Design a protein around this ligand. Structure first.
Ligand SMILES: C[As](C)(=O)[O-]
Ligand SMILES: C[As](C)(=O)[O-]
Ligand SMILES: C[As](C)(=O)[O-]
Ligand SMILES: [K+]
Ligand SMILES: [Mg+2]
Ligand SMILES: [Mg+2]
Lengths: 402, 401
DNA sequence: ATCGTGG
DNA sequence: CACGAT
DNA sequence: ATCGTGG
DNA sequence: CCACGAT
């Protein structure tokens, strides 16, 4: 069956959180982050809290024993007033001391405060936020376990990758599309993935109106491929897949036309192979159902329309995923072989999730853009610091949205 | 798993034609028809041909050895020309000699001629048509074997029934609804089935306009239950299910209202138990797909909407949508009954007396479609009007196979 | 904002 | 807004 | 119209 | 609509 590759050449089965954590303890993550200061800051508001003391102690021991990040110092900073300027002051003090990342405890679920601060941190340094009011002894082990998966990832580590056949699937997968943040405004995104689930590069457009969609969809995709290719100049792309997703303008024929043009221009510029084999797929979550056997089940609805019956992580809930081939340059002879590889690849990618230990059972090429969209929409709604990925190698190559 | 009951208390697995045929050889069908003349007529226009001769000897040996119908004689009648008048002449000659059924060989595909003759035969005597031109290419063995399943059924035999649990399922299933034969015209149907898949009674309305749909739906259903109850005075109808299907007017709210009323009125008249538990279901064939077993699998789409993955390298699925549009049930028994009605529908999908190969579509949906095909084409090519109401053999035999 | 999922 | 996850 | 299916 | 397949 499918397995995750972790450190020292080890692999562990999927769908088993306990064996994955024990694997990390024994062998380390697939890639330990390389840190510059060996220092992280814990910023909080309860200098004498027993729960804060337990949290810091668990963070310290699991970073060392689970993630094999050794000899990290955790420095503490306390803010007085639970308001933006007071907290930002401590964030700035921490940044001025030399830290690799900031772990920031906020009092409660104050949404405008959260997004103003989170937008500031994303623009400054890797960060992991936490809620003081939600901490609890009962949940602290699970809380810290999962929190560190995404924090290590935000520091540039690679917790685990998918073990996949190097001879099958795509050389890169581009998750692309757009997300409306209200009835008029939207932003485009383009993320490059390796078939083992790792994100290589990501770009987002500025917020624009729907009438600007096709223009920025092409330029955003070209920017992400230029960035991938500049930093991976020998990565040959002979087989390419686009996974298109998001709530976006109804324009299907014209979107597909522009996506083909974009690939054709990338071929002309030698960004992918001049004889790249590619397909453009629409991925859509469809209405769940319950069976009254489907792990990795592929359903053919027509030559171009498929359903992947993804299990939800009496009745067995199913969270189906619709997969439409809207364009491809495949031969009739290789078509159904290629169909099986791209559907398998989608199923494998649905096992990749660096938000925490449990799989989301949704392809990372769809899921990570939804995370980005949540942040971009709310930062705009609550007037935070705009997030500018281009020209920021840290934002382009790290999963800051987890 | 599921089995078919055949003769002499024997049962054979479903999904296995070879064992079904052998089982019939050893034990006979569930019910051998009782014939009045022990005579079948073969009517054709190929006298002294040898393809006719081996057809007749395959028919002769198989009705005897597979169907256990002993001592049958087959008489031949030759018509001089492949036209209605000439053939009708020999049909009439055969009927006057006293025969239990007619096997009629036509020379080629001739749709007006076929529906003229079939509608005449349906109004006269059990019949089976055959085409001489495609008989020459086919493997006669498979041809006659399947031919005889439906001919024996049209003569009133029961090849096999479903083995089902007498304490589970509906006491009767009424498959009802209507089918359009063009953009404006339709007819209603209502067929009463036992849970073992056997048809007890059928009625059809005359062809009417869509605007007449609801009035003839209630009347067609009342007629089928009256007819069934007069022939089964002692049958206690305490659990009733309706399977509504067919390409019909889009009047779901009004149709449901009408059906609920009909069931109510039937309770007043003691056609069904004062305490009858009933449910009204819409059955709809949905678009086929392929899995790249589902045998008996049930999918819930919502609390009232279900999907059966009927089976019919890829696995072709012919799904059936099942929506519960009304029911009598308490919330305590509700999900117990849902599983009962969905199993029952799966079971009914194994009943097909058109040949040996199951059609994997419930008989409450399939047989109305067979009827619709005949009614639509008799009206389009001007055959003899078909109505069972004044004809017990049409009301109680699968003339439409 | 540890997450997710079923209300 | 509840609660369970290894 | 053996009947089904699939291209 | 033509053509294989089925026990
Ligand atoms: C091989 As095809 C059904 O896409 O022409
Ligand atoms: C958070 As601001 C003042 O850059 O919109
Ligand atoms: C009822 As007629 C076939 O004689 O028109
Ligand atoms: K008949
Ligand atoms: Mg997060
Ligand atoms: Mg027939």
């Amino acid at each position: 069956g499918l397995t995750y590759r972790i450190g020292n050449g080890a692999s562990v089965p999927i769908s088993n959180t306990g064996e994955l954590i024990k694997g990390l303890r024994n062998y380390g993550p697939y890639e330990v982050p390389s840190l510059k200061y060996n220092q992280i800051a814990l910023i909080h508001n309860n200098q004498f809290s027993s729960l804060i003391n337990q949290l810091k102690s668990q963070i310290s021991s699991k970073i060392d024993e689970v993630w094999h990040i050794h000899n990290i110092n955790i420095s503490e900073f306390i803010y007085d007033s639970p308001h933006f300027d007071s907290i930002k002051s401590q964030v700035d003090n921490a940044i001025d001391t030399g830290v690799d990342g900031i772990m920031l405890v906020l009092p409660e679920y104050n949404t405008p405060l959260y997004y103003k601060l989170k937008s500031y941190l994303i623009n400054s340094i890797p960060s992991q936020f936490m809620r003081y009011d939600i901490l609890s002894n009962r949940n602290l082990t699970f809380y810290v376990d999962n929190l560190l998966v995404q924090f290590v990832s935000k520091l540039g580590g690679k917790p685990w990758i998918l073990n996949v056949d190097p001879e099958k699937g795509s050389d890169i997968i581009i998750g692309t599309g757009a997300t409306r943040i209200d009835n008029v405004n939207l932003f485009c995104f383009a993320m490059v993935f390796k078939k083992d689930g790792t994100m290589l590069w990501n770009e987002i457009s500025p917020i624009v109106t729907s009438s600007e969609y096709l223009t920025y969809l092409k330029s955003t995709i070209k920017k992400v491929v230029y960035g991938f290719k500049k930093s991976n100049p020998d990565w040959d792309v002979e087989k390419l897949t686009l996974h298109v997703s998001g709530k976006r303008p109804k324009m299907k024929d014209g979107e597909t036309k522009i996506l083909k043009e974009t690939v054709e221009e990338l071929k002309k510029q030698e960004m992918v192979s001049r004889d790249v084999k590619y397909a453009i797929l629409h991925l859509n979550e469809t209405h769940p159902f319950w069976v009254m056997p489907y792990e990795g089940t592929k359903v053919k609805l027509s030559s171009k329309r498929y359903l992947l019956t993804l299990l939800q992580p009496m009745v067995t809930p199913i969270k189906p995923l619709s997969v439409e081939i809207v364009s491809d340059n495949w031969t009739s002879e290789e078509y159904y072989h290629n169909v099986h590889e791209i559907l398998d690849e989608i199923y494998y990618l649905s096992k990749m999730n660096w938000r925490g230990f449990r799989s989301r059972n949704l392809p990372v090429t769809v899921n990570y853009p939804k995370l980005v969209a949540g942040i971009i929409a709310n930062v705009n709604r609550y007037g935070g610091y705009p997030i500018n990925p281009e020209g920021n190698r840290s934002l382009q190559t790290n999963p800051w949205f987890l």
